[PDB]
Amino acid sequence: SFSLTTFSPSGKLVQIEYALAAVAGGAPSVGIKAANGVVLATEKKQKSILYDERSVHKVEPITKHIGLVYSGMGPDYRVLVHRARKLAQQYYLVYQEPIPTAQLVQRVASVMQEYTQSGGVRPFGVSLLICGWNEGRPYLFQSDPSGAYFAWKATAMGKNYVNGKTFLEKRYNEDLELEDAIHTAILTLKESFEGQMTEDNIEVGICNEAGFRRLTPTEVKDYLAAIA
Amino acid sequence: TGYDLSASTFSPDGRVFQVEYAMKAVENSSTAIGIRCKDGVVFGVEKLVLSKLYEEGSNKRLFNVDRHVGMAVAGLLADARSLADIAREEASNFRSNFGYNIPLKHLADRVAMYVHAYTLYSAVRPFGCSFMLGSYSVNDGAQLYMIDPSGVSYGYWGCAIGKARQAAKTEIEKLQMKEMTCRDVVKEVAKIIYIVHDEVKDKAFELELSWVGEITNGRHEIVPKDVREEAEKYAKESLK
Amino acid sequence: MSRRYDSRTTIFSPEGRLYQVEYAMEAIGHAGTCLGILANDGVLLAAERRNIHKLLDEVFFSEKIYKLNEDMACSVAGITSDANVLTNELRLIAQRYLLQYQEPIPCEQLVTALCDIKQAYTQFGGKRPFGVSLLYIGWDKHYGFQLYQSDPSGNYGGWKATCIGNNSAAAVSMLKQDYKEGEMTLKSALALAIKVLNKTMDVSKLSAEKVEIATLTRENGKTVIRVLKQKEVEQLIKKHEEEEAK
Amino acid sequence: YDRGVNTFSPEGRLFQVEYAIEAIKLGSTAIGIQTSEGVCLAVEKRITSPLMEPSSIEKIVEIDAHIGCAMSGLIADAKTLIDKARVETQNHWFTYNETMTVESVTQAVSNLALQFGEEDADPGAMSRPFGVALLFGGVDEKGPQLFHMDPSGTFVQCDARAIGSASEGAQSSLQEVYHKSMTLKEAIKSSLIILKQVMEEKLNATNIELATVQPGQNFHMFTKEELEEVIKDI
Amino acid sequence: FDRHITIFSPEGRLYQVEYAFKAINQGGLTSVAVRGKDCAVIVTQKKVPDKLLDSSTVTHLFKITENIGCVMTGMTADSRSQVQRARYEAANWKYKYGYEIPVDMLCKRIADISQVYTQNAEMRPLGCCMILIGIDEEQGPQVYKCDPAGYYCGFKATAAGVKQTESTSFLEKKVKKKFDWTFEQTVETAITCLSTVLSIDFKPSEIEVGVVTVENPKFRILTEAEIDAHLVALAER
Amino acid sequence: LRVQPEAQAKVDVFREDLCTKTENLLGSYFPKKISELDAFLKEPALNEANLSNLKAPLDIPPCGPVNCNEKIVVLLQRLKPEIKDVIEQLNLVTTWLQLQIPRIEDGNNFGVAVQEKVFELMTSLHTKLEGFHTQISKYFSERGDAVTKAAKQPHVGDYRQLVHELDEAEYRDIRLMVMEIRNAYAVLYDIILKNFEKLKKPRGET
Amino acid sequence: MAMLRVQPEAQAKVDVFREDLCTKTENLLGSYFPKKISELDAFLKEPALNEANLSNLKAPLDICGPVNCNEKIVVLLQRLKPEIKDVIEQLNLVTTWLQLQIPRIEDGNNFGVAVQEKVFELMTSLHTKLEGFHTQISKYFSERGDAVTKAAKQPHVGDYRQLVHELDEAEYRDIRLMVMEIRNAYAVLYDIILKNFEKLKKPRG
Amino acid sequence: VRLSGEARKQVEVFRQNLFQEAEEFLYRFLPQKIIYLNQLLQEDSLNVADLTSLRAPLDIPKCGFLPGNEKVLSLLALVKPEVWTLKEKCILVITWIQHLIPKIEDGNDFGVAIQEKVLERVNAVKTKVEAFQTTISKYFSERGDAVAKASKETHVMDYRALVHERDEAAYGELRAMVLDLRAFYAELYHIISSNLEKIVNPKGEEKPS
Amino acid sequence: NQYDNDVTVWSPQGRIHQIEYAMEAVKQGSATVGLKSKTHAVLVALKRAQSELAAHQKKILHVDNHIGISIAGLTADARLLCNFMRQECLDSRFVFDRPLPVSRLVSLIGSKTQIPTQRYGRRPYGVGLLIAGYDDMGPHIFQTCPSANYFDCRAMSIGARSQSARTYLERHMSEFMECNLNELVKHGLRALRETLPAEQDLTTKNVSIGIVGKDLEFTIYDDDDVSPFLEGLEE
């Protein structure tokens, strides 16, 4: 019942320091907010053909208009899934409306802070990247295990995330349609990913006026033709 | 190294040494054996005499968990009497639940689950005792199960606990115990007890025998002194 | 509860000090520069922005500046994690005040209420202390315009002008010189804060994005809190750049 | 450090209990005496500076009308026991409607001595052993009695007992001055003789406190008047 | 302290979780399960080291419910402990959601149990990994595996124990060439997989094989007489 | 890697020899060397109360050859091979322990510390044994260097006292070294014979 | 009862030998040591071992004939020879006695055996003082020889005949301080066995 | 940095050869050289129990020729080559184990720790083998200065016995070296072969990356 | 080393040093002896005084009309456990309205000492007990250990120097059955003599006894009745 996270002689938290170093080496994940939609393209890589791609999906929706991707530990993420989804449920219980992305990320990031204080528990090993659609304005947020959530037009997360950020710094700018947002998210994803690129290796999903939806492997193959 | 300090901390090889050290404490306990046959299950235990100052019948090593369920424990006698009442609470709560006597396989499972629960927590300690559980019924028949300190039960035609075990288990394999009757099995049980004990370290002992089966009408019952002496005389015919 | 894993944060030093508390203020010492000034016609709170990137959004409000209630506001220097709970707890405390007393909370009551919570965690519980230092501004019916400063140890005190975070001692040294007690108003204090911000900040090319300024004043019986728009800050930059060089 | 308060020694004794008795050597010296005419208690105020008021120093407390008490060792732990001993004494008269035997007074207090622990306790549980040694004098149906307890909680009937820093040489001196039928007033004389030898300061009328209980008189503290008449007899 | 309790290492990993993976190979057994078209078959080795040891009381094939089979690879003490709780969770599904729990939702709750052991330093994780099979009325047969870390994924075939990569390597021969998966054919690959890696040629009494089919949704362990019928006929071709 | 079975078969015969040699080393060699050196201390050739026979009255020129002390060196003639015998026997025990020590792991390393103290003691014995024969060499070096400096400097009569003390010091050290070797047997034989259960079987039987 | 081949006849030779070490050491610990402490007191009372002023000893230097040793020092060195020789044997016998006493130790830390190890640790300090002084017996004569040598190399340098004179005083005083250490040796070693001899095992079977 | 394609080829050819070098010494030299020195130590040359006849006494007066010890010098033909051979091959075992050190990690290094603890014991063997190289050459430098001083001194005869003590130390080491070098071959085989699985597999390479 | 810090952690040999240190705590107390015949039972307790002026401590605690006990160990650990023993015996007469069987009381004593062992943070009770009592089956001598082990006994001697008494208890064990109440006191006091030093032997001040019997309830004797018991006994 004693806190496992304490202040270092330099003032920095030692436990959360390794949490941020853990999510830095996770699966490469990128996202872009352009025009009326946000593109989420992650990496699902299977170590053999026996693996069923339809059983486990890395891109999961939080609700109709909100979706979330991740780079980091598997088990700690599904704990975030249940609690964040139950937070959206307890939201809809009280407020009977779709949850805004700013309020959703705020109280979920507060759960990450509870385990930097309460004893006998380790902090989360997952850095969440949240996508949301409210009042016609798209939302792209980035949260790490430290509990501090930011906002980005485009960013990168996972292995070699520094390159993905610099690449989008050069290539990406304003006035990009959702079709260009997908194509640009694929190009920055071609850099971090290594090897042959198929529809099963990448899991892509978007959020627009119609809400957050995941892309089927059929239309993903159409984008693998370097068309849009 | 610090890895074997708590049971919740795994070893570098993926083992729990705290459970292993509880098993080494069982190896210092006195020897107890049992054998099942078509007629029933026969129990025996070597009860060492610590001093002549102890009254006859003291330090009884034959434990009765339930009417049809006998038990013989070799290990720490503190954890023995603990689990003894706890096993009786499980059999009593069973009859308070389902209204009859718990089968031996179902009882050995619930008890072993209670044993493994203390191996997980670092705030408690695992049991340092190992025991066998016999039973008999008309629907099931003679059954013998042994639970180790790690909380795992194995079905046995015969078993040996305490210091000398592997030596007594091989002597049981040299002859078929199934077609025998509890009257002839107790002759072999007393025969093995005399083989296990010699005068080197220990001084004296007493034979504690128990029967369950047709002779006892399917109920756990201790062997009377009259039959015990006659069963010894059958073993006194040989020794050699 | 293995003993070897407990650092026992309640251990006193041989000089009678707390290690976890002293390490908390050092982490605050690396936070960005945040200052505030108590003036006759209003209170002024300004701060810099250490995070600067071309891809940042920041489409909401200020960074380290929060609003406690209608009549009060605060700034933040420290770990942004512990700042979110304190900002929540301060708002909870100030609201729990509205439950019983149903009046705007005096700026003195809200400070001592959180500090009693900070002390309690350093007293017992085994949990680490808080790494955030907070400044407070606002108006009350008794003492009027108020400016306060808080430390993670739970110690606090009233201030006419102060600074926290980076370049704190440098700004305090300038406040001992230029600041005129009972003379300079909110308008004159605005030009003074910009002068102190520019000189104490070694990073050149101060822009409306790189800095943030918020004002709170009472007009016609209503507390008016605002954050100056980037164009309004750019106008102040045009004013200060004539009074710097020219 | 690297151990709990419940950790046994390689010899089988609690470290926290051993260090508790060792802390009494830093306390104040008080010498009780049991006689056929009553029980005598004497203690020094230990004034290190004239600015202090001797009225605030009470090292002899009254449990019951016929039952007195003495104090040494740690002061902080004693004020908790002095109040608890009083409550249980009145709980006796509240229940049985009689004066508690001093042996039962030592019995009820000795129960809370070793209760200390960490796990499996309540919030009203004590962490550290008592650093206080107590002397219970008094008169009852069996006559004057003088008892002693230590941090371990052992209470023993004693004809004479000394506590505090000087208890090493005072207890050996009590065996010399105590012979057979020696009365209360004679024990008061021998009390001031041993106490003056063991103290580093000078014996004065207001320097020490003297209180006695009798079979025909309730426990009484001698005021400054009577204290001047007692010291005069030296 | 990262190697004693479960906390982030300097690289962000968990060594207590990794030792839970090293606790699986300490069991000294190897199991395999193949998802077929109409069937799901589990094949594991039955070990009886003692002649006095009762063979009927030693079984590595467990029954979670009627349509779900189970096999445990890992520490035996942890294995039988998780299955009891797995039966506590499976019955809690029906007492709550009303119908027989699917194999996917069953591996999820079991994985969530291991998630609590990982995040909390009070309780240690279990050194056993569970392999579950079954047939869902919608997507057909379902074969899943849950490691002590809490990972689970849909597998066309599973491998566990001492032999892992070599067991999967033989399974890659069948899936890459896209063979036809039937009741007998899957038993043909399962026995051949374990026989070639261990160089044994298992006898019917040395192994135990659970099976489930569309026509027989109830899980059942094959009898030595049937296993022999599925042995010499397998050895025939 | 790929284990060579006929490479292990050669070493397996070697450890059986190391065990068989240790078998006869504990039951025969250890107790017999104890009674052998015990009778050697009772022999008057070693134990002598009167040291006057060690007097070296050096006289101080054509000079002539000077030999060593007959009583000391002839006594050293027995001491040196007994030092060579114990070194070989202690090395056989050490080598036997080397194959009785388990593999290299961190855990269950307590209780084998007794086995660690067995060769920790013999290491201190080896250090003494090397110093025992070294003092024998230093006796010929120091006594000779004292006489050579005496032949170079007859005007210094102290070198007469050097050789007189070096002769007495060596002979006194001889019986002290025998007390070391004989008692080294007794201490080693008592430690092993009691601990032999966990020395030969540290993990017990498989 | 060993698994090996053990000669019982030679086994009994160790049984008697160990009983010989026990019987002798017990007489050396509780009798020899305390009885010699009184005899060492009479030694320091002897006028040879009670002397403050060393002015009596002057260097018999003709600086060319041979320069012999100091007769008074040599006679006192001869009184030390049985003292040094015995106490060296005492540290050697008790060292062995300490290990023989230590019973079968399976595992754990026995405080009694740990003290028995601390006894030998204190005995090594005496062993160092004995090895040093026993070498100094010949070194007194060696450094005296090289000093008379340097006096012969430089007959007109008074620093050497002042050195030889002070070496003489350094010899006797290292001698007399050694007797005090020999007494402290028997005193401490007897105090160790007298205060607590009990702990070395957990008897009462 | 930048590297040529042949630079990695030099490492791969090095890795393959270094692998076979440790494979030969483990599965050829270690088993065979134990019975070698065992028969050598038991051979009549190294089995002589009389050290009095093995000494090389020299007359101490056209002075007579003063050789060394023919036994010690000739018995080096059994010792010296095994001293150089074992050291040369222990280097290749040290090089092989050090070459299998993966990327240095601040955790999960237990497989590397097993390698390090084997490196210390193999280097401890190399250290004692280097001490044997010293003893071989030291005997010629020490005895040379000893016999010459024994030749310069006709007044003191017992220097020859001091020279004899160097002979007993030489032949005593000759039996001690073939005993220790054989123990080395035995200790190396037992330590390497048993721990070989952990040195060849210091890391599981299960990293989720 | 680091395995003696608590009870829960097992030694590499599978032993708990804290239980050993609790079993060595009982041997640091006073030496008491007790015995039973086929009819009566006698508990001889040795009383020590803290100082010369101090009165002798009480080693005898009255439990039930037919039951008595002598305490050896930590004084306060006996008192908290005595409040447990008396409560269970009062509960027996509160519920069953019959004297609690001495074998069933001791079984409850062990269960109370089994609770602290398996849990971390709670110390075992470091007091030993020699308890006696009479029932329908006759008198019984029972001994308990802080390890929770308890045995049935004809006669035992606990404390320091108890073997010289136990050896005496072995030789006269044949007579212990057929002797009467007056002889049991003679054998009991002579058994106490062997645990005592060679200087202070027998005084009615520091020596007290108690006796239970067929129709005789447990009764404590101190001085007046003990003086004629010591008379006629040659040491």
Question: Which residues 110-139 of chain A have a CB within 8 Å of chain E?
Answer: 115, 120-123, 125
Phi and psi of A147, rounded to 5°? Answer: 100, -10
Please choose, from the candidates D191, D96, D176, D95, the residue with its C-alpha nearest in 3D space to the C-alpha of residue D137: D191
Taken in order B124, B125, B126, B131, the sign of the CA dihedral is: negative
CA dihedral of A79, A84, A89, A94, whole degrees rounded to 10: 130
Q: In this structure, which topology does domain A1-227 adopt according to CATH?
A: Glutamine Phosphoribosylpyrophosphate, subunit 1, domain 1 (3.60.20)
Up-side HSE of residue D199: CA atoms within 13 Å toward CB?
23
Please choose, from the candidates F165, F144, F177, the residue with its C-alpha nearest in 3D space to the C-alpha of residue F75: F177
Rounded Cα gap, residues G136 and I42, in angstroms = 71
Up-side HSE of residue F73: CA atoms within 13 Å toward CB?
16
Chains interfacing with B (3 or more CB pairs < 8 Å): C, E, F, I
For testing the chain E interface, which of A16, A48, A54 should be mutated: the one with the most E CBs within 10 Å? A48
Q: Running DSSP on this structure, what letter comes out for residue E155?
A: B
For testing the chain F interface, which of G1, G5, G6 should be mutated: the one with the most F CBs within 10 Å? G6
State the pairing for strand pair I41-46/I32-36: antiparallel
Is I19's Cβ below 8 Å from some Cβ in D?
A: no
Cβ-Cβ contacts under 8 Å for B228 (sequence gap 6 or more) = B207, B209
Please choose, from the candidates F158, E125, A37, the residue with its C-alpha nearest in 3D space to the C-alpha of residue B7: E125
Rounded Cα gap, residues I25 and D13, in angstroms = 7
Amino acid at I228: P
> What are the structural domain ranges in chain G?
7-205
CA distance G128 to chain F (A): 14
Give the range of the structural domain holding residue E98, as residue numbers without chain letter.
Answer: 1-237
Give the range of the structural domain holding residue C12, as residue numbers without chain letter.
Answer: 2-246
Strand partners, I49: I56
Instruction: Please check whether residue A59 is in contact with residue A42, taking contact to mean a CB–CB distance below 8 angstroms.
Output: yes
Q: In chain I, what is the straight-line distance between the N-terminal and C-terminal CA atoms, in Å? A: 47
Rounded Cα gap, residues F130 and H206, in angstroms = 52
CA distance H156 to chain F (A): 4
Residue E226's CB is within 10 A of a number of other CB atoms, namely 14
Chains interfacing with E (3 or more CB pairs < 8 Å): A, B, H
Angle at alpha carbon of residue H33, lines to H29 and H36, rounded to 5° = 150
Rounded Cα gap, residues A216 and A227, in angstroms = 16
Q: Which residues of chain E lie closer than 8 angstroms to B122, CB-CB?
A: 122, 124
CB–CB contacts below 8 A, E to H: 17
Question: SS3 for D12?
Answer: coil
The helix (H) or strand (E) run that includes residue D150 is: none
Is B77's Cβ below 8 Å from some Cβ in I?
A: yes
CATH number of the domain within which E201 lies: 3.60.20.10
Rounded Cα gap, residues E153 and E143, in angstroms = 9
Compare CB distances from I21 to D9, D156, D161 and report the shortest one's residue. D9
The residue in chain C having the minimum alpha-carbon distance to the alpha carbon of residue D3 is C3
Is G95's Cβ below 8 Å from some Cβ in F?
A: yes
Q: Contact D4/C4, CB-based, under 8 Å?
A: no
Q: Which residues of chain E lie closer than 8 angstroms to H113, CB-CB?
A: none
The helix (H) or strand (E) run that includes residue E42 is: strand E39-45
The residue in chain D having the minimum alpha-carbon distance to the alpha carbon of residue I52 is D175
Chains interfacing with G (3 or more CB pairs < 8 Å): D, F, I
Please choose, from the candidates B172, B213, B173, B224, the residue with its C-alpha nearest in 3D space to the C-alpha of residue B193: B172
Please choose, from the candidates D4, D7, D16, the residue with its C-alpha nearest in 3D space to the C-alpha of residue D131: D16
* Two structure tokens written together for C139: 């108006």
* Two structure tokens written together for C88: 């929540």
Q: Contact I122/D160, CB-based, under 8 Å?
A: no
Instruction: Please check whether residue F184 is in contact with residue F86, taking contact to mean a CB–CB distance below 8 angstroms.
Output: yes
Compare CB distances from A148 to C27, C59, C80 and report the shortest one's residue. C80
Instruction: Please check whether residue C212 is in contact with residue C65, taking contact to mean a CB–CB distance below 8 angstroms.
Output: yes
Amino acid at D119: E
Compare CB distances from G85 to F165, F172, F200 and report the shortest one's residue. F172
Rounded Cα gap, residues D180 and D37, in angstroms = 12
Q: How far is CA C58 from the centre of its chain?
A: 19
Is B226's Cβ below 8 Å from some Cβ in F?
A: no
Up-side HSE of residue A25: CA atoms within 13 Å toward CB?
11
- Structure obtained using: cryo-EM
Q: Running DSSP on this structure, what letter comes out for residue D8?
A: B
Number of domains in chain C: 1
Report the greatest alpha carbon distance in chain F: 78
Rounded Cα gap, residues I38 and C37, in angstroms = 98
For testing the chain B interface, which of F108, F109, F110 should be mutated: the one with the most B CBs within 10 Å? F108
* Two structure tokens written together for H204: 């599981």
Query: Any contact of F with D, at least 3 CB pairs below 8 A?
Result: no
Please choose, from the candidates D112, D117, D121, D115, the residue with its C-alpha nearest in 3D space to the C-alpha of residue D4: D117
Rounded Cα gap, residues I14 and B26, in angstroms = 9
Q: How far is CA I109 from the centre of its chain?
A: 13
CA distance F176 to chain H (A): 20
Instruction: Please check whether residue C212 is in contact with residue C49, taking contact to mean a CB–CB distance below 8 angstroms.
Output: yes
> What are the structural domain ranges in chain A?
1-227
Question: Which residues 104-133 of chain H have a CB within 8 Å of chain E?
Answer: 105-108
Please choose, from the candidates B172, B177, B159, the residue with its C-alpha nearest in 3D space to the C-alpha of residue B45: B159
Rounded Cα gap, residues D71 and D59, in angstroms = 5
Is C2's Cβ below 8 Å from some Cβ in B?
A: yes
For testing the chain E interface, which of H104, H105, H108 should be mutated: the one with the most E CBs within 10 Å? H108
> For residue D113, is it left (φ>0), alpha (ψ between -120 and 50) or beta?
alpha
Instruction: Please check whether residue B53 is in contact with residue I153, taking contact to mean a CB–CB distance below 8 angstroms.
Output: yes
Alpha-carbon distances, residue H122 vs B116, G155, H175, H188 (angstroms): 43, 60, 22, 7
Question: Which residues of E sit within 8 Å Cβ distance of A?
Answer: 6-13, 104, 111-112, 114-115, 118-122, 144, 149-157, 168, 171-172, 175-176
Alpha-carbon distances, residue G42 vs B189, C215, G77, G79 (angstroms): 76, 99, 17, 13
Q: Running DSSP on this structure, what letter comes out for residue H26?
A: I
Up-side HSE of residue H53: CA atoms within 13 Å toward CB?
4
Residue E22's CB is within 10 A of a number of other CB atoms, namely 17
3-state secondary structure string across chain A: CCCCCCECCCCCEHHHHHHHHHHCCCCCEEEEEECCEEEEEEECCCCCCCECCCCCCCCEECCCCEEEEEEECHHHHHHHHHHHHHHHHHHHHHHCCCCCHHHHHHHHHHHHHHCCCCCCECCCCEEEEEEEEECCEEEEEEECCCCCEEEECEEEECCCHHHHHHHHHHCCCCCCCHHHHHHHHHHHHHHHCCCCCCCCCEEEEEEECCEEEECCHHHHHHHCCCCC
Instruction: Please check whether residue C73 is in contact with residue C216, taking contact to mean a CB–CB distance below 8 angstroms.
Output: yes
Residue C42's CB is within 10 A of a number of other CB atoms, namely 22
The residue in chain F having the minimum alpha-carbon distance to the alpha carbon of residue G64 is F155
Exposure letters E132-160 (e unless 16+ CB within 10 A, then b): bbbbeeeeebbbbbbbbbbbbbbbbbbbb
What value does the CA radius of gyration of chain I take, rounded to a whole number of Å? Answer: 18
Q: Contact G108/I163, CB-based, under 8 Å?
A: no
Is B89's Cβ below 8 Å from some Cβ in I?
A: no
CA distance B15 to chain C (A): 20
Cβ-Cβ contacts under 8 Å for F20 (sequence gap 6 or more) = none
Cβ-Cβ contacts under 8 Å for E83 (sequence gap 6 or more) = E62, E64, E70, E72, E130
DSSP for chain C, written as a single string:
--GGG---TTPBPTTS-BHHHHHHHHHHHTSPPEEEEE-SS-EEEEEE-----TTB---SS-SSEE--SSSEEEEEEE-HHHHHHHHHHHHHHHHHHHHHT-SPPPHHHHHHHHHHHHHHHHHSSS-----EEEEEEEEETTTEEEEEEE-TTS-EEE-SEEEESTTHHHHHHHHTTT--TTT--HHHHHHHHHHHHHHH--S-S--TTTEEEEEEEEETTEEEEEE--HHHHHHHHHHHHHHHT-
For testing the chain I interface, which of F110, F112, F197, F203 should be mutated: the one with the most I CBs within 10 Å? F110
CA distance B146 to chain E (A): 11
Strand partners, A43: A202
Superfamily holding D2-234: Aminohydrolase, N-terminal nucleophile (Ntn) domain (3.60.20.10)
3-state secondary structure string across chain I: CCCCCCCCCCCCCCCCHHHHHHHHHHCCCCCEEEEECCCCEEEEEECCECCCCECECCCEEEEECCEEEEEEECHHHHHHHHHHHHHHHHHHHHHCCCCCCHHHHHHHHHHHHHHHHCECCCCCCCEEEEEEEEECCEEEEEEECCCCCEEEECEEEECCCCHHHHHHHHHCHHHHCCCCHHHHHHHHHHHHHCCCCCCCCCCCCCEEEEEECCCCCCEEECCCCHHHHHCCCCC
DSSP for chain F, written as a single string:
----HHHHHHHHHHHHHHHHHHHHIIIIIHHHHHHHHHHHHHSTTT--S--GGG-----------B---HHHHHHHHHHHHHHHHHHHHHHHHHHHHHHHS--S-SSS-SSSHHHHHHHHHHHHHHHHHHHHHHHHHHHHHHHHHHHHHHHH-TTBTHHHHHHHHHHHHHHHHHHHHHHHHHHHHHHHHHHHHHHHHHHH-SS---
DSSP for D179-199, written as a single string:
-TT--HHHHHHHHHHHHHHH-
Number of domains in chain B: 1
Q: Contact G67/F161, CB-based, under 8 Å?
A: no
Angle at alpha carbon of residue E115, lines to E109 and E118, rounded to 5° = 155
Is I163's Cβ below 8 Å from some Cβ in G?
A: yes
